[PDB]
C-alpha cells in the first residue's frame, strides 16, 4: 500500500573526487556514491497510474542541473534582465574547463520509493500492469541540448511518441527512438578555415530509415496521411532555430536544414551539418545572456548517438490535407522528462 506524493529526493553518482571535470565535482560535493547493491522488486498484481508531464522529479532534476550549470560554467560576462526596463552585468574570469555529462541517479529518502513501469509500449501517461519498486533511478546523463536528444535511453521495441496533449498544437511532442543514430561532430585544427566553423557528420541511410520509422509511428498514432516536407524552426532565437548543444565546454550551434526534407506522401555520401561556436549565448535558464571564452586549440571531437528528438505540430491538418512538424526544444524539462517518464515517487503507507 502506497500513495502518490512527492518529497525532497537526493542524488547518487559515481563521480571521481580526483576528476577536475565540473560534472564530477558537482556530483561529488552534492551527491553520494551510487547504490553498491541496487535492487528492483517487481510488484505482483499491481496496475499503477503514471503521468510523466505532471512529475516533480522533472522539476527537481531541472533545478539540480540549473545549479550545476551555475556552479560549473564560468562565462566571461553574465546579463540578467527583469522586464522602465534596465538590466545588470556580472563580470568574472572565464577559464576553459572540461565538460562531459556523467550518469546521475536520483534516490528517494526514507519512507518513499520509486515506482518504475516496465511496459515496452508505455506511451507516457496512463495505467501500467508491470510495475517495480526501486530506490534510485538508473544513471541519466544531463545532456542539455535542443531539437536533438543525445546520450539518452532508447525505446524497447517500437518508436515512442509522447506528448502532454497531441490534440493541442501548442504542447510539444517527444520522439524516443528504438535504434540510435550516430553523429560525429568535429571542429578541426592549420590557420585554414574559421575558428568557429565545425561540422557534424551523420550517416544518411540509418537516419533515413529511422525517419521512416518515426513517420510510420506518427501514422500509427494518428493520420496515415501526408507528413509534409518537415521544415525547420519558424522564427526564434538561435538556440531553438538550430541544434544547440555543448561539447568539451564549447557551445555548438548546428544547422539542421539537411535532415529536414521529408516529402513523404506515403513512404554513398553522408549528411554534413555545418556548425558555429557561439560564445554570446542565450542561457536556457531564462536568466538572460552569457559570453564565454574563445575555443581551445587542436581538434574538438564529440561522437554520440541521437536517441530521440522534440518537435512541435502546426495544426494545419484540421482544415488542409497535410501535417506540419517543426524542430522544437528550449525547455530542458522535456529533456529530463524523456528519461524520467517511467519513474514516479510514492509514499509508503
Amino acid at each position, epitope marked *: 500500500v502506497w500513495k502518490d506524493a512527492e518529497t525532497t529526493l537526493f542524488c547518487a553518482s559515481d563521480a571521481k573526487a580526483y576528476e577536475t571535470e565540473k560534472h564530477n565535482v558537482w556530483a561529488t560535493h552534492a551527491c553520494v556514491p551510487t547504490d553498491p547493491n541496487p535492487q528492483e522488486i517487481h510488484l505482483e498484481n499491481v496496475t499503477e497510474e503514471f503521468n510523466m508531464w505532471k512529475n516533480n522529479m522533472v522539476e527537481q532534476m531541472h533545478t539540480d542541473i540549473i545549479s550545476l550549470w551555475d556552479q560549473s560554467l564560468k562565462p566571461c560576462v553574465k546579463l540578467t534582465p527583469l522586464c522602465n526596463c534596465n538590466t545588470s552585468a556580472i563580470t568574472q574570469a572565464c577559464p576553459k574547463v572540461s565538460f562531459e555529462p556523467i550518469p546521475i541517479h536520483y534516490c528517494a529518502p526514507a519512507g518513499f520509493a520509486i515506482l518504475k513501469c516496465k511496459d515496452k509500449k508505455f506511451n507516457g501517461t496512463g495505467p501500467c500492469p508491470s510495475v517495480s519498486t526501486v530506490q534510485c533511478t538508473h544513471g541519466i546523463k544531463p545532456v542539455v541540448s535542443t531539437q536533438l536528444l543525445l546520450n539518452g535511453s532508447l525505446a524497447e521495441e517500437e518508436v515512442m511518441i509522447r506528448s502532454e496533449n*497531441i*490534440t493541442n498544437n501548442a504542447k510539444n511532442i517527444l520522439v524516443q527512438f528504438n535504434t540510435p543514430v550516430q553523429i560525429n561532430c568535429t571542429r578541426p585544427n592549420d590557420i585554414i578555415g574559421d575558428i568557429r566553423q565545425a561540422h557534424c557528420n551523420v550517416s544518411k541511410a540509418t537516419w533515413n530509415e529511422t525517419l521512416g520509422k518515426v513517420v510510420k509511428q506518427l*501514422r*500509427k*498514432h*494518428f*493520420g*496515415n*496521411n*501526408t507528413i509534409i516536407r518537415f521544415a525547420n524552426s519558424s522564427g526564434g532565437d538561435l538556440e531553438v532555430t538550430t541544434h544547440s548543444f555543448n561539447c568539451g565546454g564549447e557551445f555548438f550551434y548546428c544547422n539542421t536544414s539537411g535532415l529536414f526534407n521529408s*516529402t513523404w*506522401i*506515403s513512404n554513398n555520401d553522408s549528411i554534413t551539418l555545418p556548425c558555429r561556436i557561439k560564445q554570446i549565448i542565450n542561457m536556457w535558464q531564462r536568466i538572460g545572456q552569457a559570453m564565454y571564452a574563445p575555443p581551445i586549440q587542436g581538434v574538438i571531437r564529440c561522437v554520440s548517438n541521437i536517441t530521440g528528438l522534440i518537435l512541435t505540430r502546426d*495544426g494545419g*491538418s*484540421t*482544415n*488542409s*490535407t*497535410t501535417e506540419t512538424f517543426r524542430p522544437g526544444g528550449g525547455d530542458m524539462r522535456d529533456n529530463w522528462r524523456s528519461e524520467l517518464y517511467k519513474y514516479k515517487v510514492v509514499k509508503i503507507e
Partner: antibody
Amino acid sequence: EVKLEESGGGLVQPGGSMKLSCVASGITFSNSWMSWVRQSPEKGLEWVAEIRLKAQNYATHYAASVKGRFTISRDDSKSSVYLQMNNLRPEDTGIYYCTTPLGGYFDMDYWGQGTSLTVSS
Amino acid sequence: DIVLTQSPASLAVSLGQRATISCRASESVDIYGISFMNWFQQRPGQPPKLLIYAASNRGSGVPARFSGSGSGTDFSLNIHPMEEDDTAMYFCQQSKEVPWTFGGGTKLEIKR
C-alpha cells in the same frame, strides 16, 4: 476483413429529421477519416461530410448544400460514425454511403452498401 | 471547390477496343509531383469500386486492361482492350483537398 455497414434510412417529410449510422469492423477505426457520400437517384456522386481524428480536434466539414442541417459525429469506442440530418429538403433524397478514407494519399478504400433516404410527404 | 468536368456522359465502345474517359479539373490537383486523382467503377446496385489511385496506379486486383494517366488539370482513364463486363458507371474523384468532389460520371456501354 474490413466492413462498413450503413443503417437508419427511411421516409421522412420535408423539414423532418433522420439519423444514419455506420459501423466499421476489421479496421482500426480511430485512425480513419470517415466521410458520408450520397448518390442521387440520378446516380451522380456528391460528398456530404467528413470527420477527422481526435488529434485534429475531431474537425468536421460539411458541403454547402447540407451545412447547418446535417451533423456528422463518431464514437471511436463503438467504431461507428453518425450523420444527424435535420430540416430535410427534397434535394437530400438519395443513397447514403459511409466510406474511408477517400482523400489524398491512397491504394485502398472501403465503402458500405449504402442506405436509402427518400424525402416527400 | 475543385470542379471536375467528366466527358463523355455516355460512351459506347466495341469489344476489343479502347474506352477513353476524360476528367478536367477546375484547378490543379497536384501536390509535390503527385496528382491526387482517383477513378472508380460502379456496377448497378453496388458501391463505387476504386480502380485507379494517384492518377496512374492500378488498385490491387484491378485487371491490367485498366490504366490511368494525366497530371495537373487533365486526366484520362483507359480500358484496353475493353471487355464486356466493363459496362458500368465510372467516376473521377479529386483527393487533393476537402471538399472532396466527383466527376459527373460516364456510362460505359458496348456495341456487339
